Amino acid sequence: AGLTYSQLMTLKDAMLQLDPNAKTWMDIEGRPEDPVEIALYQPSSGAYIHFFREPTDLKQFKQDAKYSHGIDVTDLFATQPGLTSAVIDALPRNMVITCQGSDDIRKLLESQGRKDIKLIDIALSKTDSRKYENAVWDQYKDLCHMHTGVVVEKKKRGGKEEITPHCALMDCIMFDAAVSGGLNTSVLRAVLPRDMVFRTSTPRVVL
Ligand SMILES: [Mg+2]
Ligand SMILES: [Zn+2]
């Protein structure tokens, strides 16, 4: 139903790689009661937590896919169940998390019993928040491949137009760049081992 004992101990050790007093960004795709992509990012070290979750509500997921993240739902079937709750349980106590644009992070953490985590609300306008969007994707696109669908936005006077998909990890990186006043070239490093974020490794077909 969730993570094994081996896995929870690995996760506890991985969490030691977060500096509890350094700046930490957090962002999600999907609704706070039903997230499908979660990222945490410490720009000082370049360390990031990043993983995915299968949605419970498929109707809301399909609308989020068309207007936000473009994730194909079948790419989420091999995710590790219970990882979101396990990661949130494991975050350092009383740490300060920075988030942009909405109270989604607050509502996710509170729903999981982490009211100790203090949140800095950056009120960047949507336009300013994405000033480094293209540069971040160009530097880091190979860190997240999951945004495969066409994503659209409703236009000011009617109609639609294609936009770049919204990724929780790229968002953390580009939001920090916009608040910092510049995009650094930095080697980033995944905190979670790759064997923890995706589930099944048994060949479905012999070829
Ligand atoms: Mg987001
Ligand atoms: Zn992504």
How far is residue 28's CA from residue 52's CA, in Å, rounded to a whole number? 10
The range of the structural domain enclosing residue 51 comes to: 1-200
How far does the centroid of ligand 2 lie from the alpha carbon of residue 26, in Å?
13
> Is residue 90 in a domain?
yes
How far does the centroid of ligand 2 lie from the alpha carbon of residue 206, in Å?
30
> Is residue 12 in a domain?
yes
Nearest ligand (C-alpha, residue 137):
2
> Is residue 206 in a domain?
no
Residue 96 in 3-state DSSP?
strand
> Is residue 5 in a domain?
yes
Are 31 and 43 in contact by the 8 Å Cβ rule? The answer is no
How far is residue 61's CA from residue 37's CA, in Å, rounded to a whole number? 12
Main-chain dihedrals φ then ψ at residue 165, nearest 5 degrees: -60, 150
Q: Determine if residue 54 is labeled as part of a ligand binding site.
A: no
> Is residue 30 in a domain?
yes
Domain count, the chain: 1
**Residues written for the chain:** 207
Experimental method: X-ray
Q: Determine if residue 29 is labeled as part of a ligand binding site.
A: yes
How far does the centroid of ligand 1 lie from the alpha carbon of residue 102, in Å?
9
How would DSSP label each residue in 160-202?
Answer: EEEE----HHHHHHHHHHHHHTS------EESS-HHHHB---S
Q: Determine if residue 99 is labeled as part of a ligand binding site.
A: no
> Is residue 95 in a domain?
yes
How far is residue 54's CA from residue 78's CA, in Å, rounded to a whole number? 8
How far is residue 31's CA from residue 62's CA, in Å, rounded to a whole number? 12
How would DSSP label each residue in 30-94?
Answer: EETTEEEEEEEEETTTTEEEEEE---S-HHHHHHHIIIII-B-GGGGTTB-TTHHHHHHHHSPTT
How far does the centroid of ligand 2 lie from the alpha carbon of residue 77, in Å?
16
How far does the centroid of ligand 1 lie from the alpha carbon of residue 16, in Å?
25
> Is residue 109 in a domain?
yes
> Is residue 23 in a domain?
yes
Tokens of 64: 């989020």
